[PDB]
Design a protein around this nucleic acid. Structure first.
Lengths: 149, 76, 144, 129
RNA sequence: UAUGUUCGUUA
RNA sequence: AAAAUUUUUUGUUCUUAUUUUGGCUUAGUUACGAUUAAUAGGAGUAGCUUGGGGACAUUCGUAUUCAGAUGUCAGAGGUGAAAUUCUUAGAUUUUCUGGAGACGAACAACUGCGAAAGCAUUUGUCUAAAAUACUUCCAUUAAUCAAGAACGAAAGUUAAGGGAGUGAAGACGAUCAGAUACCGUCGUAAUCUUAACCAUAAACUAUGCCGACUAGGUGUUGGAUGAAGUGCUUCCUUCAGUACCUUAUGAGAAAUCAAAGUCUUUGGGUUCU
RNA sequence: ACAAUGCAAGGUUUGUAUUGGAAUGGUGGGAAUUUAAAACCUUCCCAGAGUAACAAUUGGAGGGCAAGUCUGGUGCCAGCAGCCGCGGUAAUUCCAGCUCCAAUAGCGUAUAUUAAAAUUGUUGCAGUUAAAACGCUCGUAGUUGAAUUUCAAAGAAUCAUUCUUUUUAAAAUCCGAUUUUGUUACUUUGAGUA
RNA sequence: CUUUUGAUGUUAGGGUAUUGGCCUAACAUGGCUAUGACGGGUAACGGGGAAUUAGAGUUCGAUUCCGGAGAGGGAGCCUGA
């Protein structure tokens, strides 16, 4: 765990079966179209996979089609300029700052805001080390509120 | 002797060979005879195909399901 | 880990750590400070030549009871006043009040020796004649 | 962070051998640890080990024979020339008659004796005896 | 559950 | 689009064109082209999840005290014993009403939460975290870190407010040889709120952080799985906390320690001293 | 250095104060020689050793640390003593004599420095309580960093094993066969090293 | 820290035995630095080497050889390869 304590080994473990499940008679000629429709209707890939798993019974998009969901979402040009986790961290930091500008006495909120901003900077450095973010991306704390886009 | 261990199923997740405890199942509501796929440990509300009826309430685990229905494992 | 960096590219950290930490032991600091030159009266020399100013009996420590015979010596090299123990039984009488004397350390560098407090030097010869050849037997010529 | 997988493997081997449990599970397998284990095997210090090759950088189960006093890694992997092999040996190995210092060399993992007989010293991996 | 100090130095 | 070859118009020299190849644009063809998904990390989703995590607002409770009323009449406080103190102008005591500030008992635990300092009346709103479950997403994004930064009990400082109780100073009364102390009566600052400073504590488990391995049992906190007396209630397994007991042919100088072990059989990473 | 008696040990063997003859330098003189000349060295000839006066010293004898509970003196003085300590009448420690010990033509003392010192620790220290985990967290430099991409079989040779040789994808050279296929660290060999 | 007083570089030249901010003119604002710049100390000439070394190390090297610098302290200059 990056900050605080607690190992928290809670996670999801993929099955040994790396292939598409035998019982799935459905065809991958339209799974990508389904996720494309979901993304257009407006859904982040993290929860696109979840609604695909629950409401469509097609787990492991990587097994149904040989490609991962964010990859094919990019291949259709859908993917947003700011990735999942960076955007979620930005949103959380924005909410914290909005709370703080009203409650100046929330020292605990200030500490958590510093922690989440540190996480934002670490993740941003990684994502712009990859070409997944323009080299001038900075996360100005003044402009982050509208930066969500 | 850890290679031919056989009761690793009762073991915690990520045992000698990690393997999910969840699964998938089909549901047949008596008097409804509907065909649709369901995920064990489902996370959101789900509806039927033939006649819309609540099927399982999403909880921290294997859901509450309904008082009836014939639910069958999809394993092969 | 062991409290020290171990990586193959941590040599700088190990080197600075050792360099800083070797200032902590008395021996390295004593032998490497620039103070030592201006501190001791001998200015790093093993021996020194001085002029006897007076003779004084110095009290011994509490467990003992004696009157050690010492001489106050003005060094001619720099002019500092030191106190030199005079070894021997009747050796105080062998040294008059205005003689040139040769003194050396007392054997524990700049530390006091035995029950005699605050004395770090001892007379080895007065009027260019050894106290040793003057006292333990009169093999050598008497006082000039 | 585990840093060194081989260090974990060898510490686990040594601890299991000290308990005398005769069979041990090393979770993060790797090619380096496999070659180390099979060099130990070739020198006769362990029995038949078997890699459970799942889809997750699989595990290893090795059979012990109560035959190893100490197996350990040397971190960092100091680069050792042919000349100072003896200098490292006389400090590490418990005698100049048995025990092996494992070297990674341009020719693969090997012990000090055969690295000497084949020239081309390399980097130190670990030792066992 | 009122008050009640001190014992020169060395061996 | 250019070069290599040849022939060649043409009285010290002026055309040209021919075939092959290096580079541009164009249908089609390749096995055309992307490693896992870490008991690493981050993000997400879910739960009549958890919690004295934080902020703001709001509600309650006796007690204490002030004021008023009340009934009675000699003492009341306080101590080792007293005295200072209050007391016929009615003290203390009884009952009622109104105000005030602080605090939040009992429940309350070798319990919970938090990075630590710390956090306990109700309710609401805002905010965050952690654990668990996941066939959800990314795919090395990580560990520890000089400098630097946020927070940091109490006391203390500054400015307003508050000011009951306690009370560094101080003043008495005692005790004593003395008593500037311990004890008692009073009592200023402070303690509380807001806005700023300060940056220190035996800020302590005197034990840095991350990772792996090594053992039994009794508990307990929070999830999850499976099973059963009466839709309810208990047991089993498991994860994550949190303690305790025994054991060491483990360690240690010993006290002791399940980490302070896996160290002369000395090396997983890292910072500080 | 060596030989004979006394004495001691012991089954006519060793040590051991008297004698009393050999050997030899140190020394002086001459020479050969050496040397630019001379000197030294070397060699040869003369004398030249018994208290072989041709006379070894330095520092110690409580422990560390080898060697005195021997005799005088001083008597908490004088003094010794690196440290622990000794010294007030029995001083194994001072001042002396005798003896003994140690190193020896050498032996002490002072200062510095190395080992000792794993008491500077890379190898290789320690940090609950002996000195020592920053009050806590974040965090840059630095240090460190999961797994994954080409694996075996057959033969000749020491004793029962070990040791040496060949191939088995793909793309450009050679008409069933001829041959190159990231960068560095690192490691091996060289070159050039007064 | 350096940078008016050349600091970093460009262009042109002067000077030199030759390259060069070595110097001059114009121009630009560069150059070094927590991997320690700039400073301070050295009872510091450097190396070949010396002592002590089981291995690591620690300490020393004015002094046979090599390189440098100096001839009381500075500065300047003639002759000359």
């Amino acid at each position: 765990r990056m900050y605080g304590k607690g190992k928290g080994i809670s996670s999801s473990t993929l099955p040994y079966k790396r292939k598409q499940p035998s019982w799935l008679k459905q065809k991958p000629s339209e799974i990508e179209d389904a996720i494309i429709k979901l993304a257009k209707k407006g859904q982040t890939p993290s929860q696109i996979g979840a609604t695909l798993r629950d409401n469509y019974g097609i787990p492991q998009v990587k097994s149904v089609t040989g490609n991962k969901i964010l990859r094919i979402l990019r291949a259709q040009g859908i993917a947003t300029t700011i990735p999942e986790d960076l955007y979620f961290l930005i949103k959380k930091a924005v909410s914290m700052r909005k709370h703080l500008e009203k409650n100046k006495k929330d020292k605990d909120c200030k500490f958590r805001l510093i922690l989440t901003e540190s996480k934002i900077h670490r993740i941003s450095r990684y994502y712009k080390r990859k070409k997944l973010l323009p080299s001038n991306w900075k996360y100005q704390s003044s402009t982050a509120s509208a930066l969500i886009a | 002797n850890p290679d031919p261990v056989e009761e690793s199923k009762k073991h915690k997740l990520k045992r000698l060979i990690p393997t999910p405890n969840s699964y998938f199942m089909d549901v047949k509501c008596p008097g409804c005879l509907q065909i649709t796929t369901l995920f064990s440990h489902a996370q959101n509300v789900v509806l039927c195909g033939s006649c819309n009826i609540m099927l399982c309430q999403p909880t921290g685990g294997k859901c509450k399901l309904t008082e009836g229905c014939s639910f069958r494992k999809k394993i092969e | 880990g062991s409290g020290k960096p171990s990586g193959l590219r941590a040599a700088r950290k190990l080197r600075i750590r050792r360099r800083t930490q070797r200032w902590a032991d008395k021996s390295y600091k004593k032998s490497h400070l620039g103070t030592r030159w201006k501190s001791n009266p001998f200015r790093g020399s093993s021996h020194a030549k001085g002029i006897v100013v007076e003779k004084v009996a110095i009290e011994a420590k509490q467990p003992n009871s004696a009157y050690r015979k010492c001489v106050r010596v003005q060094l001619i090299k720099n002019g500092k006043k030191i106190t030199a123990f005079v070894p021997g039984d009747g050796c105080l009488n062998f040294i008059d009040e205005n003689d040139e004397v040769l003194v050396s350390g007392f054997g524990r560098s700049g530390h006091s020796v035995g029950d005699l407090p605050g004395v770090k030097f001892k007379v080895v010869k007065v009027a260019r004649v050894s106290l040793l050849a003057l006292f333990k037997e009169k093999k050598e010529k008497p006082r000039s | 962070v585990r840093m060194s997988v081989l260090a974990d493997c060898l510490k686990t081997i040594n601890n299991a051998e000290k308990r005398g449990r005769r069979q041990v599970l090393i979770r993060p397998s790797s090619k380096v640890v496999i070659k180390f284990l099979q060099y130990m095997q070739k020198k006769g210090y362990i029995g038949s080990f078997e890699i459970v090759d799942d889809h997750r950088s699989g595990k290893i189960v090795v059979n012990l024979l109560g035959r190893i006093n100490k197996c350990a890694v040397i971190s960092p992997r100091y680069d050792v020339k042919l000349d100072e092999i003896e200098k490292i040996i006389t400090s590490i190995l418990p005698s100049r008659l048995f025990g092996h210092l494992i070297l990674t060399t341009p020719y693969g993992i090997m012990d000090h004796e055969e690295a000497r007989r084949k020239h081309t010293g390399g980097k130190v991996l670990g030792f066992f005896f």
